Design a protein around this ligand. Structure first.
Ligand SMILES: [Mg+2]
Ligand SMILES: [Mg+2]
Ligand SMILES: [Mg+2]
Ligand SMILES: [Mg+2]
Ligand SMILES: [Mg+2]
Ligand SMILES: [Mg+2]
Ligand SMILES: [Mg+2]
Ligand SMILES: [Mg+2]
Ligand SMILES: [Mg+2]
Ligand SMILES: [Mg+2]
Ligand SMILES: [Mg+2]
Ligand SMILES: [Mg+2]
Ligand SMILES: [Mg+2]
Ligand SMILES: [Mg+2]
Ligand SMILES: [Mg+2]
Ligand SMILES: [Mg+2]
Ligand SMILES: [Mg+2]
Lengths: 52, 147, 187, 129, 52, 122, 127, 104
RNA sequence: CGGCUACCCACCCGACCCGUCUUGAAACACGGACCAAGGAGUCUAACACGUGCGCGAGUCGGGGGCUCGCACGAAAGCCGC
RNA sequence: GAGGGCGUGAAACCGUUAAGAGGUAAACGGGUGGGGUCCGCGCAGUCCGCCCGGAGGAUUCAACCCGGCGGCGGGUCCGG
């Protein structure tokens, strides 16, 4: 039971991965190549009103 | 990663990376530091000289707590306080000098290096090297002992 | 066979960079194109240093990168570094020099922009100098690594000055037999 | 005489035996798959004459005639209509091959779409009614 | 690196007149291998050990 | 950012059938099925593709607008051409040659249009 | 989605409780839906089935338009037996076919004061 | 989003959807399987709080303590534009496209 | 009509039964009647070297604390007097 | 072809049928030959795609302009 299960990551690398993922979520070719249907979808990252 | 481990690649070879003649069984030499003086002296000596014997006095109940003195160099002596402070304090105003108190920064003894510019400062500390004391006297600063 | 000589088939070299950095691969593509299409040995050496590893690209320091420009003949040239240029806590005055490096640290970028210098990346370095004219290509202290101070012909036999491995640098750790002439021998 | 692909030369394989394992005839616990023997007394490893031959790099087929069916195509496995329509650009060198788990009800639609797009399929007339 | 303006969509899909400037997180660099590394280590963090 | 998007998409996408053979794209806007850089219709700012028409007869041509990216509702303009195969082959030749829009993949668009007009009429 | 930390999504535990449930739980297990006119008239979705309920079989070998009465309820086998649904053995002796009560549309209930109280609780809780 | 006011109740049982917060961004939710570029739907306060929570290259993050955005390795990184720029093609040898095959 | 091929047979030449201990094994050296399943370089700590990433004269929260009670949440996010 | 240790049912081993062979124990590698099962094909009758000149019928654009929306391109960067 004392296998080295959990792995600590640097917080700068954690925030770097968050910034990289959020930046890659903006390009349409990347998300279409991940496979989401963005044919009839309007402008990239969608900003809805605060009534939502 | 066992898929990147060497063991999965060596499946098929008979002796498994340890020879047919030598036969690595359990412990052919000993365990740990076995034979430090008898039969492994060419590895204990010639790679760790000084390993065997006594060397000096035996300070009973020694703490790493009375000899606490983190040393600061004259290169580090400026950047304990911000550069805005030294610029706006020695930008041709008067003969005043800013005080760099190393005890608040967490350092006790001021040692001597190079790179101490013309602008004089007053250093408060608990201990000084006479090199740094001469450098402060040469640039025109002062030397204050605190406790 | 035929060749009576020994077979050393692959020499030493690292052609493809082992790093999976996409930006480094794009710079590898660009400077490989320039190195094979410009006849610029500057681009040859910069392409080899981009192939070079993480450890063998040591971090340049700001005082060294000043002093290698302070020599006569380096007035308006740009200091090009394949590697990182870091802050130095020592110096106080920074000239108006031009920097072309990869991953300059935050305090170094801040002090160069306060002093008035111009930092670049390798894409703008290629757009400004294809053949690499007006550049001084610098490197850092490779031998200053702590790992290289354990390396020698021996740790102690002609006293060797080469730092044997031990836990705590002090008394009672490797100081008796072979370190002094009163206890056995002396190296 | 169905679709007749491009100019494909005389396809040779340099041997066509899919080399047997040593002493697979003597014991039936040994499957016919090749496995390099690493013994210290073995005639196969020592390469005595009259023994079996070990597969080495010299039996490599030509890159022009590599993975070539005798019809002249190269096979590509297909499950459905989209993976059949991806062969629309290179249909005269890369033939289709319907997967085994595809039922007859969709298999007839796949072979009809292959007949429309003029894509060679290796097994058109299998699992019919 | 330039920051455009993105239209804010209403709940009906119509483009409102509100335009919020694109933040620089979407202009941050994209390192998918660093994302894969940090994602692998957090997946190792995300588990009960297993049977012994 | 086209080379960044290529260095990300060229592996680990929801495409790239690497099934014991050559690599294919399947790429819902494409001209040649090879997953290459020149023949790629999702990454570039200027992309050309041809598709069969939904009415059974004719070929639809999908070209990227280039007036605005990050807006895929209007990023692709489509046209429907139903002519007697030589008029539409000449029409796509005029549309690709006489504009600056992608002088590459002329032959890709032309061969895919010619193959689909062969496969469509009987 | 399951949010209580005291109830299982566990397959082994659910099948264990299901196949070893006591009889007062097995009555709730063997509950049957109602016809559309009777659920419109009573405002209740489903009821546990009893000895004398009228049954229209909706699925299986027998489907629809066979409104018969149940006779036995094996709660050990989770099986009701219906009077109309028959099957002959080899020796010409008839025997009832096993029908699970979830594939059963009740057309008429059995009236009782206890079932009126149950129906009132169903209507009040459906609200 | 931010300021949870029933949006988890609205988006709780839609199949395939993901409940995710601005102040608590998850790598396991933003890039499942280690593959970047997941389709995300923001809000006004979310899309305005992103700049407050990370910053630009001019200012730091005002919500986090000591975070800045990382320095980009290539400023203008269109490789085709760079290789077709006149400054690069001014300083090239010649396009040498002869083959010079084996002579029997 | 054509067909290499895990079908069978014949013919010419070559061809001792594998594994290991050994300088040397086909050995009058040892184990193996046959077949199916299981079966042997793992894990922890420490060190050294190389590689890859982040920050870089600094670096690291692994120890706790903060968020509303959420399946994945035993995750993740934040602390900076 | 699920019949009460009854899903699927391999190998070692055995029975029968079909085929072939039999003095150098059997088995193997290289090379062919013969036989048999099976596969693809029509077996003196099997090739396609383009252009042009002939032979017969049927259609409407294209050539040039007017009408129109949608896109590429750049000048005054008019006008924001
Ligand atoms: Mg070996
Ligand atoms: Mg040994
Ligand atoms: Mg040779
Ligand atoms: Mg030998
Ligand atoms: Mg032997
Ligand atoms: Mg369990
Ligand atoms: Mg030996
Ligand atoms: Mg001996
Ligand atoms: Mg023996
Ligand atoms: Mg024996
Ligand atoms: Mg086994
Ligand atoms: Mg290292
Ligand atoms: Mg059975
Ligand atoms: Mg069965
Ligand atoms: Mg079953
Ligand atoms: Mg059998
Ligand atoms: Mg016989």
């Amino acid at each position: 039971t004392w296998r080295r299960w959990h792995r600590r990551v640097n917080t700068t690398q954690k925030r770097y991965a968050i910034c990289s993922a959020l930046a890659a979520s903006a390009l349409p070719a990347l998300v279409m190549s991940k496979g989401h249907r963005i044919e009839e979808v309007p402008e990239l990252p969608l900003v809805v009103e605060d009534k939502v | 990663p066992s898929r990147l481990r060497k063991t999965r690649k060596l499946r098929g070879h008979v002796s498994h990376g340890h020879g047919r003649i030598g036969k690595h069984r359990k412990h052919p030499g000993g365990r740990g530091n076995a034979g430090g003086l008898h039969h492994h002296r060419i590895n204990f000596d010639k790679y760790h000289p000084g390993y065997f014997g006594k060397v000096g006095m035996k300070h009973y109940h020694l703490k790493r707590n009375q000899s606490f003195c983190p040393t600061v160099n004259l290169d580090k002596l400026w950047t304990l306080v911000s550069e805005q402070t030294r610029v706006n304090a020695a930008k041709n105003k008067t003969g005043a000098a800013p005080i760099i108190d190393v005890v608040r920064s967490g350092y006790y003894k001021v040692l001597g290096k190079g790179k101490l510019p013309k602008q004089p400062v007053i250093v408060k500390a608990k201990f000084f090297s006479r090199r740094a004391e001469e450098k402060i006297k040469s640039v025109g600063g002062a030397c204050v002992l605190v406790a | 066979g035929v060749d009576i000589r020994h077979n050393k088939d692959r020499k030493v070299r690292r052609k493809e960079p082992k790093s999976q950095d996409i930006y480094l691969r794009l710079l590898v593509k660009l400077y490989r194109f320039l190195a094979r299409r410009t006849n610029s040995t500057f681009n040859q050496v910069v392409l080899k240093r981009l192939f070079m590893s993480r450890t063998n690209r040591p971090p340049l320091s700001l005082s060294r990168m000043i002093r290698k420009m302070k020599l006569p003949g380096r007035e308006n040239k740009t200091a090009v570094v394949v590697g990182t240029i870091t802050d130095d806590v020592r110096v106080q005055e920074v000239p108006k020099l031009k920097v072309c490096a990869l991953r300059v640290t935050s305090r170094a970028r801040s002090r160069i922009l306060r002093a008035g210098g111009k930092i670049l990346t390798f894409d703008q370095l290629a757009l400004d100098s294809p053949k690499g004219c007006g550049t001084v290509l610098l490197s850092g202290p490779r031998k200053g690594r702590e790992v290289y101070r354990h390396f020698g012909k021996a740790p102690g036999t002609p006293h060797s000055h080469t730092k044997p491995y031990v836990r705590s640098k002090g008394r009672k750790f490797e100081r008796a037999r072979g370190r002094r002439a009163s206890r056995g021998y002396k190296n | 005489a169905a679709l007749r692909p491009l100019v494909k030369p005389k396809i040779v394989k340099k041997r066509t035996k899919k080399f047997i394992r040593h002493q697979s005839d003597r014991y039936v616990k040994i499957k016919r798959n090749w496995r390099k023997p690493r013994g210290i007394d073995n005639r196969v490893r020592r390469r005595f004459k009259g023994q079996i031959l070990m597969p080495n790099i010299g039996y490599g087929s030509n890159k022009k005639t590599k993975h070539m069916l005798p019809s002249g195509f190269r096979k590509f496995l297909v499950h459905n209509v989209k993976e059949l329509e991806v062969l629309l650009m290179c249909n005269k060198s890369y033939c289709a091959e319907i997967a085994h788990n595809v039922s007859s009800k969709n298999r007839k639609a796949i072979v009809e779409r292959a007949a429309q797009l003029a894509i060679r399929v290796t097994n058109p007339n299998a699992r019919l009614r | 690196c330039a920051r455009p303006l993105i239209s804010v969509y209403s709940e009906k899909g119509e483009s409102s007149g509100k335009n919020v400037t694109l933040p620089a997180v979407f202009k941050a660099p994209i390192r998918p291998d660093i994302v894969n590394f940090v994602h692998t280590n957090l997946r190792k963090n995300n588990r009960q050990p297993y049977a012994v | 950012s086209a080379h960044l998007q290529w260095m990300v998409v060229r592996n680990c996408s929801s495409f790239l059938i690497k099934r014991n053979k050559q690599t294919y794209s399947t790429e819902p806007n494409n001209l040649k099925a090879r997953n290459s850089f020149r023949y790629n219709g999702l990454i570039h700012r200027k992309t050309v593709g041809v598709e069969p028409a939904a009415d059974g007869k004719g070929v639809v041509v999908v070209i990227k607008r280039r007036s605005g990216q990050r807006k895929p509702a209007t990023s692709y303009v489509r046209t429907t051409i139903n002519k007697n195969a030589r008029a539409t082959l000449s029409s796509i030749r005029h549309m690709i040659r006489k504009n600056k829009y992608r002088p590459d993949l002329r032959m890709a668009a032309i061969r895919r249009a010619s193959a689909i007009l062969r496969s469509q009429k009987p | 989605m399951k949010f209580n930390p005291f109830v299982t999504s566990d397959r082994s535990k659910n099948r264990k409780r299901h196949f070893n449930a006591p009889s007062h739980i097995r009555r709730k297990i063997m509950s049957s839906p109602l016809s559309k006119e009777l659920r419109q008239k009573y405002n209740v979705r489903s009821m546990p089935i009893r000895k004398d309920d009228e049954v229209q079989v909706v699925r299986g070998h027998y489907k629809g338009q066979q409104i018969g009465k149940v006779v036995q309820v094996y709660r050990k086998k989770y099986v009701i037996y219906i009077e109309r649904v028959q099957r002959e053995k080899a020796n010409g002796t008839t025997v009832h076919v096993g029908i699970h009560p979830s594939k059963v549309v009740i057309t008429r209930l059995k009236l009782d004061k206890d079932r009126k109280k149950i129906l009132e609780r169903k209507a009040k809780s459906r609200q | 989003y931010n300021e949870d006011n029933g949006i988890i109740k609205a988006f709780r049982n839609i199949p395939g959807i993901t409940l995710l917060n601005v102040s608590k961004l998850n790598i396991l939710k933003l890039a499942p399987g280690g593959h970047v570029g997941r389709f995300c739907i923001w809000t006004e306060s979310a899309f305005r709080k992103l700049d407050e929570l990370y910053g630009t290259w001019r200012k730091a993050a005002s919500l986090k303590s000591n975070y800045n955005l990382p320095m980009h390795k290539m400023i203008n990184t269109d490789l085709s534009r760079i290789l077709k720029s006149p400054e690069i093609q001014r300083a090239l040898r010649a396009p040498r496209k002869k083959i010079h095959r084996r002579v029997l």
